[PDB]
């Protein structure tokens, strides 16, 4: 009943007798599978989990300079040198500035000048790689008919609630078997290698905000970088040496590139970190379901004899189906709930389609609640529940 209300809902009906059913499970979406003589089961992709990520390259976006020094020489006196030129922690660049008698040298010509400054990174971002073996998908299976509204918001105690089952698929084990109790088991043979090309996508970690970026664009980041887990390369990207009229050389820091990083990531998929595992909010997956080992719980029950009373008024869902919640005052349960659509009230020719396949009541006590989903035909129709004179009927209109 959890698929009722999602706009990305896809209805599939497999061939009669066949065991294999191909479905395409999207993130945040819900897939309802139906089959002849087989119950209605909801399959949903819940969350994408990637573990054991490896770093590739770290870029520096916020730095600070200190202990800036310079050294100058007269023309034809060789190049200028400072002690700091030997330290890989500093950034140095040499130029030629005009010199003469007005500057303190005896000859006119190009004089060599060197300027060094200490590079130290304050705030950095880190890029991590995704190993295909360390990839984990979470899929939820659920059948229509039981598990009323009281478990709609519930995330603790799922091992005790037997109506739902958790299945987790990785490229290390693309097969799974879920025991659904009364209905048997369901098989999942998914295609992990052909789900989405993650070899050309990298995991980007900013200041507690995370994106998914293309592999080539991250190698093109114009910031000081160093590979592996120190020694920074291309420090020049963050330090502007302003030469004023080819005479003086000063050093200035550029501001925080957080604005340039954020504007560039506009369009990439945002993600979140849950401890050591990374959670994604995007990605699709194709799967093949084995319908063989699935069975209908209670197909042999008898028909409910007493009357029903509407608990909630039939309302129309987004995709045109109608949800009805009814109360049964009878005591001869468990019994099969007689539901159908009718065009003529004398013939009662069953038209339309039943979403909750073979709806049944399992509780044996009176005043038991139960809820089902219906797909009425286009236009005017009648929802008839029960048998005999005590039956309840409601008029419906579609399109």
């Amino acid at each position, epitope marked *: 009943i959890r698929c009722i209300g999602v706009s990305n809902r896809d209805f599939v009906e497999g061939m009669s007798g066949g065991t294999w059913v191909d479905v395409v499970l999207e993130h945040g979406g819900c897939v309802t599978v139906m089959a002849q003589d087989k119950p209605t089961v909801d399959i949903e992709l819940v969350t994408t989990t990637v573990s054991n990520m490896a770093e590739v390259r770290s870029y520096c976006y916020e730095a600070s300079i200190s202990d800036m020094a310079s050294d100058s020489r007269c023309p034809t006196q060789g190049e200028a040198y400072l002690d700091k030129q030997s330290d890989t922690q500093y950034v140095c660049k040499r130029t030629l500035v005009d010199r003469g008698w007005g500057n303190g040298c005896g000859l006119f010509g190009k004089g060599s000048l060197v300027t060094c400054a200490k590079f130290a990174c304050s705030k950095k971002m880190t890029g991590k790689s995704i190993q295909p073996e360390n990839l984990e998908y979470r899929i939820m299976l659920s059948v229509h008919g039981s598990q009323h509204s009281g478990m709609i918001v519930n995330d603790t105690g799922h091992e005790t609630d037997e109506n739902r089952a958790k299945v987790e698929i990785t490229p290390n084990s693309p097969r799974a078997e879920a025991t659904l109790g009364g209905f048997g088991s369901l098989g999942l043979d998914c295609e992990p290698r052909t789900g989405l090309d993650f070899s050309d996508l990298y995991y980007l970690t900013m200041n507690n905000k995370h994106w998914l970026v293309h592999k080539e664009w991250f190698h093109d980041i114009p910031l000081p970088w160093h590979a592996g887990a120190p020694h920074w390369n291309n420090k020049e990207a963050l330090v502007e040496f302003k030469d004023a009229h080819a005479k003086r050389q000063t050093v200035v820091v550029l501001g925080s590139q957080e604005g340039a990083v954020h504007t560039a990531l506009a369009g990439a998929l945002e993600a979140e970190m849950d401890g050591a595992k990374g959670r994604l909010s995007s990605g699709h997956l194709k799967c093949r379901l084995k319908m063989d080992k699935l069975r209908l719980k209670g197909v*042999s029950y008898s028909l409910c004899t007493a009357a029903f009373t509407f608990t909630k008024i039939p309302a129309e869902t987004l995709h045109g189906t109608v949800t009805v919640e009814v109360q049964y005052a009878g005591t001869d349960g*468990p019994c099969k709930v007689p539901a159908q659509m009718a065009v003529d009230m004398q013939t009662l020719t069953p038209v339309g389609r039943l979403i909750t396949a073979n709806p049944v009541i399992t509780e044996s006590t009176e005043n038991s609640k139960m809820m089902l989903e219906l797909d009425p035909p286009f236009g005017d129709s009648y929802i008839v529940i029960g048998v005999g004179e005590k039956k309840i009927t409601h008029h419906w209109h579609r399109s």
Partner: antibody
Amino acid sequence: QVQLQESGPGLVKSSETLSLSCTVSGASISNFYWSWVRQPPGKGLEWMGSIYYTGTITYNPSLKSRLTMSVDTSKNQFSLKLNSVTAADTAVYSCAGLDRFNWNDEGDCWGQGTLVTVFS
Amino acid sequence: QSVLTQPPSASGTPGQRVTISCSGSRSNLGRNTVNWYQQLPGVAPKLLIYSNNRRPSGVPDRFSGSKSDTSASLAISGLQSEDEADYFCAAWDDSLNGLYVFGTGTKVTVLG
């Protein structure tokens, strides 16, 4: 369509191990919880144990200390083994396919039953 | 297994309607169907009622079963001498791992 046939020793010695087999004919082995029942003369009906083709087992609590059950998927057979039988366990044993859930329009199916006597 | 309560014996004259009660609890009938079997001495039990009101093909129409919340009942119209036997109600229970529970059984005797 469906037929069940019991087969096993008609007479067994005391303190030895009792084994009985049940063959399924004309139906899929995966549609029933295959179970064993017995009737000691003078007492009432007692369900011994139930097993599914996957290997899920559940035994009568008063007999788990003494009872083992087996299932063969390829031969459409399943067998029963009872250790350390007494003179009290002389009864009419019968195999059948119970319905833990209905799943079947024709209801449950039952075999023919056999008389096993423990003599000592 | 658990125990399902039944009366010891039910009596009647040839041609009467005889009823047999079957009292259980919330664990067995509160969540499962109930079946009826006709037991003869020295043979396997014979199926009479499954899903609590259905007769397998071949059972005479004179056998019928009804149920309530924690109770069930079996009715036989037109009692004849060919029905002298024991009758057992049995049902699945949702205890530790699932038990098939048999009742205490009730003997039907054509009064002499």
